[PDB]
Each structure stands twice: as C-alpha cells, then as structure tokens.
RNA sequence: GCUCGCCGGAAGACCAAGGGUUCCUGUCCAACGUUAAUCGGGGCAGGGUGAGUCGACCCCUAAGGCGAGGCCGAAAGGCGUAGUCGAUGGGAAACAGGUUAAUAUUCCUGUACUUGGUGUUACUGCGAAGGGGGGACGGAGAAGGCUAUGUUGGCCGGGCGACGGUUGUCCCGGUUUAAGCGUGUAGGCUGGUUUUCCAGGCAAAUCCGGAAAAUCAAGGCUGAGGCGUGAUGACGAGGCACUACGGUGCUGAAGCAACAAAUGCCCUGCUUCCAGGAAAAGCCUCUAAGCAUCAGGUAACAUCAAAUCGUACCCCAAACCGACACGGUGGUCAGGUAGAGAAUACCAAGGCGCUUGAGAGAACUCGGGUGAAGGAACUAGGCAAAAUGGUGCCGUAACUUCGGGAGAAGGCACGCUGAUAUGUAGGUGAGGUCCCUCGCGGAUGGAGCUGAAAUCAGUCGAAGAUACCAGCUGGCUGCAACUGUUUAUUAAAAACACAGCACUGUGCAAACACGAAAGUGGACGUAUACGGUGUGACGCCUCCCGGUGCCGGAAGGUUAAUU
RNA sequence: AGGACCGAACCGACUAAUGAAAAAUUAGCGGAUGACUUGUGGCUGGGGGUGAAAGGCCAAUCAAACCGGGAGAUAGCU
C-alpha cells in the first residue's frame, strides 16, 4: 500500500529547506522560534 | 461538407463530420506560429475562475492579422488552413512585397484570390476598407469598434454584420446578436461573411470529443449537496427554488449588463 | 603557478594499505592523503617539488568518514581526500 | 561436496529514486536474529569508491518561482516589466579486452574521439543585445530493408560408453571480436546553377522572402545495415607447470555458411486522420555600429587543457515507503522447446529452499482430490462448486438505429506413420552465364537452406484442442441509451458524467469568477463565441400567469439622506 | 476507422472463502489506443481548496485539516 511519505530530497528542500524558510517572513519567524527553543537541527537541511 | 459517420460503434453512430478538402494538408506557416499554453481556467491566484475548462489537445497559436493595415499592397491567397484556435478558417496570404499574413478566410475566398486593404481598395469579398467607404446595406465581418484597434465583431465561423446606416461620423451596425450598435465611421471592416459556415452542423457524438476540445464535464447544481450549490440537497429529486448560479444569482432571465459607459452606443438591444 | 607555502600545506601523508602497496609496485602509482581542498594540479605540483619526481597524472577521490559509536555516544570520522599519483616510468620514490 | 526441489518477462542481471558503509577482510557471540548459531545486513578493528568522453556541475529554455524600477495595498504585503532561476526536455567527445578480497566505459593494455585556448605559417572582411535558417516536435496504420538474437549444417577439439545397442545420418563442448576511420548502400526529402530587380524581415544586409530572366536534368541533404580496415592483435574449448587447495604462471584449435528473426534501428521517415501536435540555446548564415592594412575570421601543424563533485553496496527489497529481517515502488536487459503470444508448462544463464525443528497421523478448522443413486429437492438467492473452453470448416432466429444481434444456437474434423512430394505450395537465394553510366550495380539462373496447409492409406489408445492454457448457453422482463466516473478503508448502482435538446444571460474594458486593489482567468476568444440553469443517445412527442420569482411599464399613492 | 472485440503487461476492485497486513489473500472478476495509464517537477490552503458530486479527498485525521496560542474556555453533568 502506497503510504503517505514518499521521500524526495529536492522536493523536501524546496518545501521545508533553509532558503525556503528564509524567503518569507513567516518562515523566518519559525526559524527564530526554533533558535530560541535551542533546536540542534534548525531546518530539514542536512 | 457535413458527413454523417456510419454507426460502426456507439460513440461513432451520431457523429457528423465537417470536412473541407480545400484546407491545407500540411504543417502551418511556422514564422506566424507561437506558443500558447493551457490555463485550466485558473488565474494568477491559481484558483479556478471559470469552470469546465481543462485538458484538450496541444495547440499552437497562429498569429492572425485582425488589424489588417497593409494598405495599397495587393495580396494573393496562398492557401486555407485549419486553426485550432477558432471556429473560423484562416487563409495564408502573400503580399506583393513578400510578406505573408494569416487572415480570417471569408466565405467565397480560395487559393489564387486577390485581396486588398485600404480606402481605395475594391469593394469585393476579403477586401478591407473603412466603413465610411463601404456602401450601406453591405455585409462585412471582422469589424473594428475603435479605429486602429483591430477587428472584434463578427469573427466566428459563419458570422457577418450588416451596415444598416451611416449618420455622419458614425454608422449603425446590425450585430449577429440582433443588437443595433453605433460605431465610428472610420473604423475598419472586411467585406463579406466569415468562412466556415457549416461549422455549426458538426456534432461531437461522444463525451471524448468534448474532452478533446478542452471541456471538462458539467455537474448539475441540483445533483449536489446544499453546502456546494444553492440547488443542492433534497431527498430524492427536489428542486423547490428559483434557478440561480452557484453564487446565488438568478439565471433564467435576470439581465446583468451594467456598463453605463457604452450605453450610448447601443441603439437597440437584442431580442 | 602555485605558491610554495600552499604546496607544503597540500600533502598530508602517504597511505599504506595492500591496494596502495600493489599500486606502488606494479603501476608506479603512489597513494597519498591530501588536503580536502587540494585540487589535482596542486597535488601534482607539490609532488614534483617536495618529492622531486615527475608526475604523469593524478586521480583523486573523496573518502567519506565512517560513523562510529564510542560507548553510547555516536560520532562521525572526518572525510579526507585520497590521491593516486602515477609517476613517470623509471621514477623510483623513497 | 554430492543428490533433491523452486523461480526463470524472475524469486535473474543493470540503473534511477530513497537509503548512507549495509560493500570486502579479520575477529567476537553478551544484546539484536521470533530457536541454535561457529553464521549475519549484529559487536570491534582495518580496508575499499581513481573519469577530458558516464552523471552532476556547465550553456538553453517549459510549467512555474523570485523580481530593480513599477502599479496596488492600514502595516505586514499582492501583482508584475526588465531580468534572473527553474528538467521531467534541447546542447562536444570512447570503445574492446585484462585486472581487485572489495572500483572500473574511472586502473592497466591496445586502438580512438572532442572543444577550447596559446603559438604558427598561409590567407584576408571580421564584427550583435539585432535579421534569417535550423533545432522543432501529434495519433494511428502499413509495409519494405536491416540488425540484435537464435537454429541447423560445416569446421575444430574431445569421446567410444556402470545396463541391450552405440566408429556413426553417433555423443559433449567451442566456433567471439568493439568504438573509431573509409566506403555512402536499402531507402527518404527536394529540382539545381547563374543573372536582374523589389513598399517585406523595427535599421542594414551579399542572408531569408517575393518577382522576373537564362540554362542544365542531375544537384544537394539524409540514411539503417552490409563490406573493408580496427585485428600478424585480443578472447578462445580446454591442455600443461606450481599449489597457502583460494588460485597463480605458461599455452592455446577452429573461429565459417545458410536459414529464421524482433516490440530494437532506417523511421524526427512514409501514408493517413483531426482532436491540428513546446521553448530557447548550442549550430549555420546576414549584416550594423565599429575597426581598417591591426585585430578578428579558416588553414593545417605544434603544444598546453579539460577543473570540481559523484562513483562502494541495496534498489520489486532483510538496506527505500510500511513501528518489524512485515503490501507499495519508475526505467533498461528479454535465451531454449512447445505456443498467436512479454499467456502458460518445462528448462538455460543466474539466483534461491522463504531463520524454529522433531514426531504423531484424534476431533475440529483451512486449502485441495474422488465419490453409488438422485441432479437445485439446497438456499433469501444455484452463493460456492461443477460445467463450457482452441484452430479450421459447415451453420446460425426474433428484433434492428441495417452497423448489429453473432463466437447467436448447433454441429463436424483434430494424435502418430507412410505416400502424394527420398520436403510439396511458397520463402530465401550461391556458383555459373550475360549486361554495365562499374558498384554495396542490373539481368538470367537455379545449387543449397527453410517450409506450412491439404488429400489418400495405415496405425495405437478408453480417450489426439489429451497436460498447463482455454466463453456456459438460451427465453421473458424493470432501470440506465452507449464507452466512462463514484463513497481511499462495509454502498460501483437505477447515483454522477455523457453526446444531444431547451431556456437564459453576455457587444467585448463581455457576462461571470479569484482578488480592500492592482491585476488575472474568461480569451490572445467576439454571439456559428463564452457563462448559468435544467433535461439527457435515437424515435414519436411535450391546459393554468391567481401564488412566488423574473422581464417590461411608469399615470397615481407611499417613500431616505438632504432642505 | 473505432471513447470497436478477445486477451498478458498496466490500471482497477464485482463475488468468494480466509491479521503476514491499522483494508491484505487466494480463486475467479472489469478496462486494457483512451473521457487510458504512468515517472519527474510545478500550482490551487481551511469556511479555503479540489470535486464526472459520495459531503468525496486535502499526510492512517474532515458537515470545516494540523500545530501553537486566547486557555485553567464553559460544564445547573459524571
């Protein structure tokens, strides 16, 4: 059965990657939030 | 000519083809071509703005000349061509100076016919001259509404317009709709009717044919649930309401012209 | 033209392994560890100057670092650049 | 190690994606492995991924994204021009053999190619953000020419049979060879060459386009395959020396022909249809500003250059997505016998026996086999089973929209051997002989090879479409015309859609829709068009305006802000 | 020629019996040149999308997704 997650690196990066997050305001805020929390992996970026 | 196809299969039974042998069997004039990608009836927001559009065959865009400005040069018709972009047929013409253009093929036009634009041009089919030069009572097509803009009225397969009157700076046209309309007398127009008049006699004959023409199927509002359409819901088949659009506006009669800027040019509305 | 200092900083070490030994003995090819940033021409220049020996050609590759586990803690070894340097016929290297 | 069994259009081989060391070697067996474990995709250590020509990067663009100015917007921001990104598409170049425990079109051996510089001598119009050409394009169908590949014969090597026979019309194996370079064929497309002029190609153009005029019928482009060379080479069945029993080193015959033949190539071709079928660069070409005897261009020759990143391994799976060593997952390769076949059966190459076993041979459950007599009596219901099942030929009703119905129904033949005919009809096609504008040519010729289908005669069986495979059929009737779609995971239908019909709106800055707007779709469309609503092939058809809607009217009544 | 026929791949999911499986199995079943199917990338966003329309689908979630916040909502109820 085709399960929901069907990985694709490029698609992952474009969707969720660092630059994408940077591009828009809301993404930047998300980034800031994550920094505040102390996340080790700020983004999906490997 | 129209051709009723033999019923060798359902979906072929009711088919009627409109076959013109005189069209060009060959690849169109490539210089005048250009790309034309499909919308899916969706705008820049990405939302569907006009339902029932989608798919269909890849099509190129022939660059038709509706402005028709090569004044004084006589042109000769090379061939008639299938345009997927319109109900009419187009004609590839060759001006004496070596330029080629696509034009709406009028009714009587065929290969070898000579045509001409200009004030001086002769009043014969396919020739184009300002409507102050065109005699009253003539049939014309590809009519400009604004001078210099390009023909906008009467471009569809078997349309034409009647010049009923010329009163000073304006002439009054009889549009195919039956609407009588004033138009500036200096606007341009092409003599005769537009060509492919038996276009209406074709019948698709199956669902797939409609799809080929980029038309997605139509769901009736009454078949929906109320949350979707004003007509939705009802146990079994119920329709206890006045007909309306998906957006609640009355459909069977309610007029919707709101343009107060051009009211003056409409002599008489259609009926 | 490569600067001497850069040349000196290129070459990290000789690589000892069975495959390396075989390459040395048969094909007259030395296997070096080099700076990850070091390009082929650079490596060649450095070979020529610092080992005083003619080079035919350099093949390079990047070795990825192994993931290991010290006790309970996971940790990755460094990636590093390997270079097969083929030396001109009759070139004997100390 | 020897037997047995399974897959073999896969359960084999190679990739992409995704994973990220799982690869190889040594070592260990606590935990992990549904048992044991000396084994492991487990632990620990070490090793392993070599590129000018493969891919990325790079040049070009699609859908789309971002977007200087700009337009719009309380703010945030939205749209969008110039631009710039964006492959899943276009754009230069490599093949064969050998080698590692583990990489290889990357190492080595041989033989190649590419496109840049730089320098040269030789020549002499070069030059783009611009013009033109090209790239550049659909579906289906039909062949013909080919090859991949396979079969047989020939040849070469080996063999003479654990049991009757087996020196022959016997048995086993092998019989392979690239890119490149030369040739330019089967075939496809197109008339060429020169001269003159011209409101066209945002300017110019010697280019394209268009007009004339002259002259010759061959000119050019394209093109699989074959042939030659590449190759006195490599590889080569197996023989022979050493042996850490893993292998290593030497050596090495023949290496031809015919037939058959793709879904691969010629073919981005041809024929045809309507639903009318990317873009841009690379590439060719034309000039402009320019420069002017310099640069630049093309000409060979020399030299330098090709960086960087990926390259292990899995990849229909125990390594990816599924919590698991648990169904899903795109591409490429496609042997033999039978067969229409990529179905099916048995096999090859190759890969596996699915990580608990041993007994026993109760009930009951699951999955199968057979069954006297009856044959739907079962049951809500013939559910399920059983049955039918192929090719050829004969034959086939109502009704019909004249196409259908129809494989209607129902029947007959079917194996093997011999003869017709020491293998026919056909297909292919060598020598020889003749012609020739000479070649991959044309005629004639028929050797050899291959080879159905039929008829007649015989013959065995209970049975010859013998296994696997492979329609059940007919009669009346509701609904829906039909092919389609649908509740992912209890509903596939009479529901939706449909072609068709009708009403209605909409004159283009269209109606309408998304948008505080700008704008966008509608549509680069224009009433033979587009939108909305209902009905729903086809046939015969299809009173009430009082109510509520809509349309038109505006005499009077009433009536806002305002005053 | 064909939204033509029989039929593998491929797409589905009518009947049947039966956790390896949070929808599968085997045996049969429908389509199989098209209103087909499929890879890669792109766009549409929550009273919003998309919808051959079933209130279907929008990450095992849908008559209004998920995450965080108002928030210790309110609970004459248990």
Q: Which of B194, B223, B240 is the last residue of a domain?
A: B194
The residues near B13 (Cβ < 8 Å, ≥ 6 apart) are B5, B7, B205
DSSP characters over A1-46: ---S----HHHHHHHHSHHHHHHSHHHHHHHHHHHHHT-SS-SS--
Distances in Å between the Cα of B212 and the Cα atoms of B26, B39, B84, B162, B220 are 21, 15, 11, 35, 21
| Helix, coil or strand: residue B232 | coil
Q: Is B78 in the same domain as B149? A: no
Which method, experimentally, gave rise to this model?
cryo-EM
Edge-first strand order for the sheet with C29-34 is C11-14, C29-34, C80-87, C55-63
Instruction: Say yes or no: Cβ of B21 under 7 A from any atom of strand E.
Output: no
Q: What is the CATH number of the domain that holds A40?
A: 1.10.287.3980
Q: What is the CATH number of the domain that holds C58?
A: 3.30.70.330
Number of domains in chain C: 1
Closest to B16 in 3D by CA, of B7, B31, B5, B25: B5
Q: How far is it, in rounded angstroms, from Cα B117 to Cα B142?
A: 13
DSSP state of B194: B
The residues near B40 (Cβ < 8 Å, ≥ 6 apart) are B48, B53, B54, B55
* Positive or negative: CA dihedral A16, A18, A21, A27: positive
DSSP characters over C50-76: HH---EEEEEEEEEPPPEEEETTEEEE
Q: Is B186 in the same domain as B199? A: no
For residue C34, what are the β-bridge partners?
A: C11, C81
Residue B35 CA, nucleotide D278 C1', distance (Å): 7
Closest to C11 in 3D by CA, of C82, C87, C88, C86: C82
| Domain that residue A14 falls in | 1-46
Q: Is B24 in the same domain as B108? A: yes
Q: Is B88 in the same domain as B126? A: no
Closest to B143 in 3D by CA, of B163, B115, B125: B163
| Domain that residue C41 falls in | 2-94
Number of domains in chain B: 3
Number of domains in chain A: 1
| Domain that residue B199 falls in | 195-271
Output the CA angle C14-C19-C21, nearest 5 degrees.
55
Q: What is the CA radius of gyration of chain B?
A: 22
Instruction: Say yes or no: Cβ of B207 under 7 A from any atom of strand E.
Output: yes
Q: What is the CATH number of the domain that holds B106?
A: 2.40.50.140
Neighbours of chain C (3+ CB pairs under 8 A): none
Residues 54-73 of chain B with CB under 7 A from strand E are 54
Distances in Å between the Cα of B100 and the Cα atoms of A9, B92, B110, B153 are 51, 7, 16, 24
Q: How many beta carbons lie within 10 A of that of residue C82, not counting itself? A: 16
Q: How far is it, in rounded angstroms, from Cα C89 to Cα C55?
A: 9
Residue B242 CA, nucleotide D545 C1', distance (Å): 16
For strand E, give the nucleotides within 7 A of a protein CB: 1-4, 21, 23-24, 34-36, 40-45, 49-55, 59-60, 63-64
């Amino acid at each position: 059965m085709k399960r929901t997650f069907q990985p694709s690196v490029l698609k992952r990066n474009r969707s969720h990657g660092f630059r994408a997050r940077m591009a828009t305001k809301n993404g930047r805020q998300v980034l800031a939030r994550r920094r505040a929390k102390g996340r080790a992996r700020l983004t999906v970026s490997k | 000519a129209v051709v009723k196809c033999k019923p060798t299969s359902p979906g072929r039974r009711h088919v009627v083809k409109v076959v013109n042998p005189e069209l060009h069997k060959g690849k169109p004039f490539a210089p005048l071509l250009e790309k034309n990608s499909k919308s899916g009836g969706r705008n820049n927001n990405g939302r569907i703005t006009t339902r029932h559009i989608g798919g269909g065959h890849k099509q190129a865009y022939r660059i038709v000349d509706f402005k028709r400005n090569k004044d004084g040069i006589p042109a000769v018709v090379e061939r008639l061509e299938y345009d997927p972009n319109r109900s009419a047929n187009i004609a590839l013409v060759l001006y004496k100076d070596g330029e080629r253009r696509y034009i709406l093929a009028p009714k009587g036009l065929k290969a070898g016919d000579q045509i001409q634009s200009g004030v001086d041009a002769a009043i014969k089919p396919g020739n184009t001259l300002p409507m102050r030069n065109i005699p009253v009572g003539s049939t014309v097509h590809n009519v400009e509404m604004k001078p210099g803009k390009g023909g906008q009225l009467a471009r569809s397969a078997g349309t034409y317009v009647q010049i009923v009157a010329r009163d000073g700076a304006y002439v009054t046209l009889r549009l195919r709709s039956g609407e009588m309309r004033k138009v500036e007398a200096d606007c341009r127009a092409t003599l005769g009717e537009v060509g492919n008049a038996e276009h209406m006699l074709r019948v698709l004959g199956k669902a797939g044919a409609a799809r080929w023409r980029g038309v997605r199927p139509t769901v009736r509002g009454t078949a929906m649930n109320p949350v979707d359409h004003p007509h939705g819901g009802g146990e079994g088949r119920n329709f206890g309401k006045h007909p309306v659009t998906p957006w609640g506006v009355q459909t069977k009669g309610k007029k919707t012209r709101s343009n107060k800027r051009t009211d003056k040019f409409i002599v008489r509305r259609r009926s | 033209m490569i600067r001497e200092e850069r040349l000196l900083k290129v070459l990290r070490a000789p690589h000892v392994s069975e495959k390396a030994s075989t390459a040395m003995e048969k094909s007259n090819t030395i296997v070096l560890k080099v700076a990850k940033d070091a390009t082929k021409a650079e490596i060649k220049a450095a070979v020529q100057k610092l080992f005083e020996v003619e080079v035919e050609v350099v093949n390079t590759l990047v070795v990825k670092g192994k993931v290991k586990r010290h006790g309970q803690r996971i940790g990755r070894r460094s990636d590093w650049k390997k270079a097969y340097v083929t030396l001109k016929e009759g070139q004997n290297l100390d």
